[PDB]
């Protein structure tokens with residue numbers, strides 16, 4: 001169990017620690033760490049919730065629904081907080097393509113992978129800090145999809161992150 005705290009994930013922003021910057025986020029208000037589904041679950045319109053019961057409100061998609069963190073292109077620091085550390089296989093990061101439609105359901109086919117970090121089947125610390133590169137053809141509202149792949153289960157934790165790139 002874990003979430004991306006910086007830039008705050010869509011689920012994390014639904015919690016008090018995230019400032020309640022997103023409203024009406026279901027289970028994300030209290031447990032943004034709990035978005036767990038089998039690896040390689042990428043159902044269109046169910047990326048933000050990973051199809052998980054009680055997280056459905058996260059799947060709404062419009063240009064103005066969610067709070068964005070202002071960021072630049074180039075290096076971006078990602079910080080996870082893990083409420084329950086687990087042995088780890090992988091960390092994968094995707095971002096929406098230039099030209100994507102922020103008023104349509106999220107579809108993984110409209111993202112590129114932009115980073116992949118091997119977990120080496122070790123148990124990470126409670127705070128995990130990684131640096132990924134945001135490609136320079138992205139401007140404006142984009143969604144980063146951060147995926148923490150568990151080493152000793154068939155599951156992963158899924159974190160959609162709303163950013164405004166300038």
Ligand SMILES: [Cu+2]
Pocket residue numbers: 001002084085086
């Ligand atoms: Cu867990």
